[PDB]
Scaffold this active site. Structure first.
Site, PDB file in Angstrom:
ATOM      1  CE  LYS A 253      -4.138  -1.960   0.291  1.00  0.00           C
ATOM      2  NZ  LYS A 253      -5.280  -1.887  -0.665  1.00  0.00           N
TER       3      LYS A 253
ATOM      4  CD  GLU B 227     -10.300   3.652   0.648  1.00  0.00           C
ATOM      5  OE1 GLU B 227     -10.438   4.867   0.437  1.00  0.00           O
ATOM      6  OE2 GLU B 227      -9.528   2.949  -0.065  1.00  0.00           O
TER       7      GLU B 227
ATOM      8  CB  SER C 135       0.169  -8.071  -0.604  1.00  0.00           C
ATOM      9  OG  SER C 135      -0.691  -8.811   0.252  1.00  0.00           O
TER      10      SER C 135
HETATM   11  C1  LIG Z   1      -1.278  -6.520   3.041  1.00  0.00           C
HETATM   12  C2  LIG Z   1      -2.494  -6.458   2.138  1.00  0.00           C
HETATM   13  N1  LIG Z   1      -2.632  -7.263   1.082  1.00  0.00           N
HETATM   14  C3  LIG Z   1      -3.686  -7.213   0.248  1.00  0.00           C
HETATM   15  C4  LIG Z   1      -4.760  -6.349   0.413  1.00  0.00           C
HETATM   16  C5  LIG Z   1      -5.929  -6.348  -0.549  1.00  0.00           C
HETATM   17  O1  LIG Z   1      -5.985  -5.044  -1.227  1.00  0.00           O
HETATM   18  P1  LIG Z   1      -5.621  -4.855  -2.797  1.00  0.00           P
HETATM   19  O2  LIG Z   1      -4.176  -5.202  -2.955  1.00  0.00           O
HETATM   20  O3  LIG Z   1      -5.967  -3.426  -3.163  1.00  0.00           O
HETATM   21  O4  LIG Z   1      -6.515  -5.831  -3.528  1.00  0.00           O
HETATM   22  C6  LIG Z   1      -4.729  -5.410   1.545  1.00  0.00           C
HETATM   23  C7  LIG Z   1      -5.863  -4.519   1.830  1.00  0.00           C
HETATM   24  N2  LIG Z   1      -5.756  -3.629   2.731  1.00  0.00           N
HETATM   25  C8  LIG Z   1      -6.615  -2.719   2.931  1.00  0.00           C
HETATM   26  C9  LIG Z   1      -7.934  -2.681   2.195  1.00  0.00           C
HETATM   27  N3  LIG Z   1      -7.754  -1.848   1.005  1.00  0.00           N
HETATM   28  C10 LIG Z   1      -8.865  -1.695   0.233  1.00  0.00           C
HETATM   29  C11 LIG Z   1      -9.523  -2.762  -0.371  1.00  0.00           C
HETATM   30  C12 LIG Z   1     -10.684  -2.573  -1.114  1.00  0.00           C
HETATM   31  C13 LIG Z   1     -11.230  -1.303  -1.287  1.00  0.00           C
HETATM   32  C14 LIG Z   1     -10.598  -0.184  -0.728  1.00  0.00           C
HETATM   33  C15 LIG Z   1      -9.425  -0.358   0.039  1.00  0.00           C
HETATM   34  O5  LIG Z   1      -8.739   0.680   0.595  1.00  0.00           O
HETATM   35  C16 LIG Z   1      -6.228  -1.649   3.825  1.00  0.00           C
HETATM   36  O6  LIG Z   1      -6.999  -0.673   3.938  1.00  0.00           O
HETATM   37  O7  LIG Z   1      -5.109  -1.713   4.386  1.00  0.00           O
HETATM   38  C17 LIG Z   1      -3.534  -5.478   2.428  1.00  0.00           C
HETATM   39  O8  LIG Z   1      -3.409  -4.668   3.486  1.00  0.00           O
END
Ligand SMILES: Cc1ncc(COP(=O)(O)O)c(C/N=C(\CNc2ccccc2O)C(=O)O)c1O
Ligand SMILES: Cc1ncc(COP(=O)(O)O)c(C/N=C(\CNc2ccccc2O)C(=O)O)c1O
Ligand SMILES: O=P(O)(O)OCCNS(=O)(=O)c1ccc(OC(F)(F)F)cc1
Ligand SMILES: O=P(O)(O)OCCNS(=O)(=O)c1ccc(OC(F)(F)F)cc1
Ligand SMILES: [Cl-]
Ligand SMILES: [Cl-]
Ligand SMILES: [Cl-]
Ligand SMILES: [Cl-]
Ligand SMILES: [Cl-]
Ligand SMILES: [Cl-]
Ligand SMILES: [Cl-]
Ligand SMILES: [Cl-]
Ligand SMILES: [Cl-]
Ligand SMILES: [Cl-]
Ligand SMILES: [Cl-]
Ligand SMILES: [Cl-]
Ligand SMILES: [Cl-]
Ligand SMILES: [Cl-]
Ligand SMILES: [Cs+]
Ligand SMILES: [Cs+]
Ligand SMILES: [Cs+]
Ligand SMILES: [Cs+]
Lengths: 395, 268, 395, 268
Positions: A86, A108, A376
């Protein structure tokens, strides 16, 4: 009218109240300008290297594949500052916010990793950060709430609806629709209205670019497949992007199966939902027969979202990527396995991707296959949740 | 039909503006909602804006979010909303009836089929809150095929291109947004922007109704004085329902009193 | 007799029961052999790069030094797998354990970062790990207890004495004296009997080697000073080693001042103790007039130890390094400052080093100085402790 | 003085081994410890090994750790230990008295001064538990200057070089370790290793006393039968003190009974 295509086949678009269109157009113009600006690119590259710690390692697992013909590498986004992928695109979006003269950030968060990334970038770059987070996630991902607040971010629990990611997304968008003159909405995934799916991909694509370079260096060839979990789609599209034109490389995305698809308690709209309009996009979503948006469920807060980014829906539709599901129990087993046999504590989200790779190996143990899993994030945020489960089920 | 066109011509002849309340259909139940709507009309409403309950109403603040929740607690579905609409139209043949929709409820079982259902029950307009003019083609086309006015939003910072599009694409009325943000009575908007009102007229747009944050008769008068054709009030009306859930008689008395006073202010 | 010098001036030695001498001699022979073995060096280098994530970033702080003539860089050991510098030398010692045919590991831990490192290396390399940890630290560093156990390590709370690091050290040594035939004692700091201070330095010296290369690249010159906290001495000697012969580069070590030196509740034996024999070494220690070993105190578990490694006592004696102290409150302020202005949550141990660098800047704000602080770990382990303090003192 | 030399010559003439109890000085208080020690002697102890309480006794298991703690709870200091030693020697002029020390207590106010204090109160030997032969020079030199025997350890896996060093450097007795690990009664060692006993004799070492885990008369007999000059028992004795803290009369009766039985086994 837009500078870039808002659609991926049928999916995507800009389904927001009219009030927000100028903000989206402004963001798109600023991104297009920044992508051509050598100074912007140098600033972003400097932060990624010297502040976030890129390139991240590519680790060959040497115990979990013993006795099979699977070679498995883990792309170590868990090693990035903040503890998840992220952070990459938050640094890019924060620089865009500054470029557009914004002083405040709305975000969010579900797992709290996007919230942590938003808070750290705001502390570094001098922005005022407010983060919306569902009340259920505030409890089950509590370490990240503490981290966000120590960095000076306002964290606002959301009790509405399912009190999880969907509800946090709703509140963030409501806020932005009144505060866009001064605030940038730092959307945390490759979903939502154009231009977010495109920007998030472009600011995450170093994951796959680095992976390709590293796997060529170590194996002299491309992977047979790359595998990533799918919450909204950012880590998966970040890994996939640089491989899309390498037709031999499988792209596998893993949605949360929760308690089991048959229970209806899951977060797997790409394969089990149907197309709808919500959160600014036309995309697969979990919905009732009448078109009300369903509540999702996953043991992992970061996957607990009833839709998915439109580029994944498109890649699936044309058969370029395949999507599968992994249940809570399969994810927990993969979590335990990595801790005990590789000494890496993975996020529960990432554990879904690993669980699928372990199934690909176990189901066909004499199949020669070179696999990369996008790890991730790290699992520090999950250790209290996992403990309480393994205790209750008596281990 | 031409229900908005007929209403605005009548109002112009009487030199007054429209007052248009909003409520959520089925809040706090089907029978009480029908009585509320009859009271709104009897007290002077010129037209109605009616919400279909939706799980995730993202242009709405807590007051209207909670109205949606009450309707769901009463088991209200879109199908039941269409039954209500039929009953309202059967009692009130000339009052313009507009729906406030979220896109997924329109898109769900087919856009064309949605607008066809609207025509059959006698709805006059549909405003899809999360479909900007840029995404509007299949919605406005289906609306016109079924004799429904598609309603578009003119925000405070609309540029010239948007004003031209809203004037060409919309029918019935043009929605003049008071302010950014979501619905809510406590958040009062700006004075209706004269330049927008004047440009919409220059481009022959449907007549403008100002909405968001209009909660007082003074704001209604100010809207008509600025040259808008009328005003919409939602959260202020819904607050009276929420306040009086255990006292239905008192609810209707206070609704009547408020609507009458808001209508008087449109005269103007 | 030994292959290498067991002393640094007067300090050091091998003050263990006779039973343990062959084990120490065996360890020394194995280290000397390994240091000449290109295969061993390649294996260690591969793990450091592809598993732990080296080289770690060197981050220039750009907000906390505003308005002064201080340039401050942070060496980001917080980015290492595990979350602290402790991982570097555990990987080296685990490889030594395997080289010597040992199948089990004993370790002590205070902050739990050495415990986490020991557990992760044991999971990776197939060793059975038991970790001793004082009962007080089990409480105040609880996240790390959960991490160690999820990785399959046995964590044994020690209730004896102060129930902190000294007591864990005692129990680890007692255990080893009965189990050395099958178990390697993975001592977690640059202290204890020869050859541990030497081995730990040599397996931590990449910290300073990388720092020198990175600061030359970015500034074209050496730092005016490098600054590191001192619990037993490993992160500090790791940073210092490659600079010892660069006579212009100041070496500053920071001991915990606890509630204040004058209270006697501190962990600063180098500057406030006196030479004694304990934990296998002759070194400065906190002791009573009669020669009983005193209990130390620090808000930070990793610094809460009443002695110090002998190479630091030597460097101090000859004036090559200077040692100072930082109190609990000064460390807490530095913790808050880094979180809020740089978006980095530092370990409370590392916060002591940062607090001193901030004092060097604030005391003389027009002094031109290029400083590096070794940011030895991340502060995830400390967030619940810091929260509870800042709440009680009413913030 | 030559107290060990005189004892071993007397024991050789009588064809028996030594039995040497260990206790912590001042456990569970000064007065009771003095009575315990008098009881040990009256019951047949040939020599004594006496611990000075230390904050961090790293060659000791929980039994003796807890003895140290009891002495500290009674406020026992090394100074008070020297007062006790003087009183013991004044009552018992020929019994060899050995101290079990940790290095820091010897090093603290000067090594030479420590051994000088030992000589003045009439101590015969000092075993420094965490000083191996490799670090022993200043300790053994000071010991010999003050007519104190420095005691060294022969571990089970001693090589030839170590056996030669222990034989040359030590005096009084050689400590033959039963096993690896720390002190403790429940952890019983190996049968005294004949090859070590025989080599120590070949190199003219001081006579061997076997210690660690010796808790039964059978183990004492086995040690003498293997050619050791005697045996030391600590934790087994200290367990009797710990068991009987509220019953001092019963404590001394059980101590007498155990010591008598252990001594009988040395005869052998
Ligand atoms: C380590 C890790 N690994 C994979 C994922 C999955 O998220 P992706 O890589 O975007 O598919 C996350 C998702 N995390 C979120 C959700 N984030 C989130 C998810 C969906 C809608 C809005 C959001 O802000 C967060 O807000 O931290 C994560 O922390
Ligand atoms: C991030 C960080 N930063 C600095 C330090 C201070 O340790 P140093 O760098 O060795 O001086 C620690 C100390 N940590 C200990 C104490 N480790 C420890 C300390 C003293 C004796 C034995 C030990 O095992 C641990 O066990 O994790 C740390 O975690
Ligand atoms: O009086 P308030 O503040 O409650 O406002 C009432 C508005 N009710 S409504 O149906 O006109 C209405 C109109 C447009 C809306 O969103 C959009 F602008 F994005 F399209 C939402 C509600
Ligand atoms: O009967 P146990 O098991 O309690 O053993 C009693 C031993 N008491 S002692 O003074 O001889 C004694 C002798 C040597 C010791 O440590 C060293 F070997 F490292 F030097 C510790 C205690
Ligand atoms: Cl395209
Ligand atoms: Cl595309
Ligand atoms: Cl196209
Ligand atoms: Cl299209
Ligand atoms: Cl606008
Ligand atoms: Cl299932
Ligand atoms: Cl279409
Ligand atoms: Cl040297
Ligand atoms: Cl040296
Ligand atoms: Cl020398
Ligand atoms: Cl020396
Ligand atoms: Cl040995
Ligand atoms: Cl102070
Ligand atoms: Cl000396
Ligand atoms: Cs394999
Ligand atoms: Cs999802
Ligand atoms: Cs500066
Ligand atoms: Cs210390």
């Amino acid at each position: 009218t837009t500078l870039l295509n808002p659609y991926f086949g049928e999916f995507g678009g800009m389904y927001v109240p009219q009030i927000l269109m100028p903000a989206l157009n402004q963001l798109e113009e600023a991104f297009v300008s920044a992508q051509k600006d050598p100074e912007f690119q140098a600033q972003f590259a400097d932060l990624l290297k010297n502040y976030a710690g890129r390139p991240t390692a590519l680790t060959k697992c040497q115990n979990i594949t013993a006795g099979t013909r699977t070679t498995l590498y883990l792309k170590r986004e868990d090693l990035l500052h903040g503890g998840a992928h992220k952070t990459n695109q938050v640094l890019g979006q924060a620089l865009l916010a500054k470029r557009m003269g914004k002083s405040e950030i709305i975000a969010e968060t579900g797992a709290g990793q996007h919230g942590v990334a938003s808070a750290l970038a705001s502390a570094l770059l001098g922005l005022k950060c407010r983060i919306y987070m569902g009340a259920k996630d505030v409890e089950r991902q509590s370490p990240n709430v503490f981290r966000m607040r120590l960095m000076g971010a306002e964290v606002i629990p959301v009790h509405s609806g399912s009190a999880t990611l969907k509800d946090a997304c709703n509140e963030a968008l409501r806020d932005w629709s009144g505060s866009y003159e001064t605030a940038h909405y730092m959307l945390g995934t490759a979903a939502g209205p154009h231009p977010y799916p495109t920007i998030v991909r472009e600011f995450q694509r170093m994951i796959g670019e680095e992976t390709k370079a590293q796997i060529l260096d170590k194996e002299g060839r491309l992977p047979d497949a790359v595998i990533a979990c799918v919450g909204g789609g950012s880590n998966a599209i970040g890994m996939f992007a640089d491989f899309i034109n390498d037709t031999s490389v499988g792209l596998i995305g893993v949605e949360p199966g929760g308690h089991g698809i048959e229970t209806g308690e899951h977060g797997a709209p790409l394969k089990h939902g149907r197309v709808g309009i919500y959160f600014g996009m036309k995309a697969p979503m979990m919905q009732t027969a009448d078109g009300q948006i369903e509540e999702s469920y996953s043991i992992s807060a970061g996957l607990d979202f009833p839709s998915v980014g439109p580029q994944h829906a498109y890649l699936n539709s044309i058969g370029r990527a395949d999507y599968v599901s992994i249940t809570d129990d399969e994810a927990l087993e993969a979590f335990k396995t990595l801790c005990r046999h590789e000494g890496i504590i993975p996020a529960l989200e990432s554990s879904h991707a690993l669980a699928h790779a372990l199934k690909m190996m176990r189901e066909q143990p004499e199949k020669e296959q070179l696999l990369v899993v996008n790890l991730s994030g790290r699992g520090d945020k999950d250790i209290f949740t996992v403990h309480d489960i393994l205790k209750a089920r008596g281990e | 039909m031409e229900r908005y066109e007929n209403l605005f011509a009548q109002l112009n002849d009487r030199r007054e503006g429209a007052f248009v309340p909003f409520v959520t259909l089925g809040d706090p139940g089907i029978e009480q909602s029908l009585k509320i709507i009859d009271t709104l009309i009897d007290a002077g409403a010129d037209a109605l804006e009616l919400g279909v309950p939706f799980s995730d109403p993202l242009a709405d603040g807590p007051t209207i979010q909670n109205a949606n929740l009450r309707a769901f607690a009463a088991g209200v579905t879109p199908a039941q909303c269409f039954e209500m609409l039929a009953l309202i139209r059967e009692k009130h043949p000339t009052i313009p009836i507009g729906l406030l929709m979220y896109a997924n409820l329109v898109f769900n079982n087919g856009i064309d089929a949605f607008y066809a259902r609207c025509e059959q029950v006698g709805v006059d307009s549909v405003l899809v809150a999360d479909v900007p003019v840029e995404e509007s083609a299949p919605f406005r086309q289906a609306a016109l095929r079924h004799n429904i006015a598609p309603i578009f939003i003119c925000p405070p910072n609309a540029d010239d291109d948007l004003l031209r599009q809203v004037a060409s694409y919309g029918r019935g009325y043009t929605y003049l947004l008071s302010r950014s943000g979501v619905t809510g009575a406590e958040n009062r908007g700006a004075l209706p922007l004269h330049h927008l009102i004047e440009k919409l007229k220059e481009y022959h747009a449907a007549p403008a109704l100002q909405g968001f944050g209009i909660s007082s008769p003074e704001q209604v008068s100010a809207a008509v004085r600025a040259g808008a054709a009328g005003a919409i009030s939602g959260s202020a009306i819904v607050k009276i329902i929420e306040k009086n859930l255990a006292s239905p008689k008192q609810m209707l008395a206070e609704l009547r009193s408020f609507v009458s006073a808001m209508k008087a202010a449109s005269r103007a």
